[PDB]
DNA sequence: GACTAGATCAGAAGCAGTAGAGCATGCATAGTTTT
């Protein structure tokens, strides 16, 4: 019901997944995904799946996010 | 396009079991020597 991951850790794990896919090593992808699964809650994992597939469906336009930012 | 995963065939290594050869133990029998 509670996670123990920070944003930097998640970015590092995703970077490892991408790089190891580029290098044709699936064991490291499995290890990174296992760490993410073991150190995350169900909601966090749902959002991680959405981020991996690259579709969040927030309902707010990218232009709106940029306008809010600056 | 590139790459991965599942299924399948062939060859090879491991293991089990039988056969064949070799090594040690003892004695049967006979021969030879001694009295």
Swiss-Prot record:
It comes from Homo sapiens. DNA ligase involved in DNA non-homologous end joining (NHEJ); required for double-strand break (DSB) repair and V(D)J recombination. Catalyzes the NHEJ ligation step of the broken DNA during DSB repair by resealing the DNA breaks after the gap filling is completed. Joins single-strand breaks in a double-stranded polydeoxynucleotide in an ATP-dependent reaction. LIG4 is mechanistically flexible: it can ligate nicks as well as compatible DNA overhangs alone, while in the presence of XRCC4, it can ligate ends with 2-nucleotides (nt) microhomology and 1-nt gaps. Interacts with XRCC4; the LIG4-XRCC4 subcomplex has a 1:2 stoichiometry and XRCC4 is required for LIG4 stability. Component of the core long-range non-homologous end joining (NHEJ) complex (also named DNA-PK complex) composed of PRKDC, LIG4, XRCC4, XRCC6/Ku70, XRCC5/Ku86 and NHEJ1/XLF. Additional component of the NHEJ complex includes PAXX. Following autophosphorylation, PRKDC dissociates from DNA, leading to formation of the short-range NHEJ complex, composed of LIG4, XRCC4, XRCC6/Ku70, XRCC5/Ku86 and NHEJ1/XLF. Interacts with DCLRE1C; the interaction is direct. Interacts with APLF. The chain holds residues 139 to 208 of 911 of the full protein. It comes from the Eukaryota. This is DNA ligase 4. Testis, thymus, prostate and heart. Belongs to the ATP-dependent DNA ligase family. It is linked to LIG4 syndrome: Characterized by immunodeficiency and developmental and growth delay. Patients display unusual facial features, microcephaly, growth and/or developmental delay, pancytopenia, and various skin abnormalities. It is found in: Nucleus.
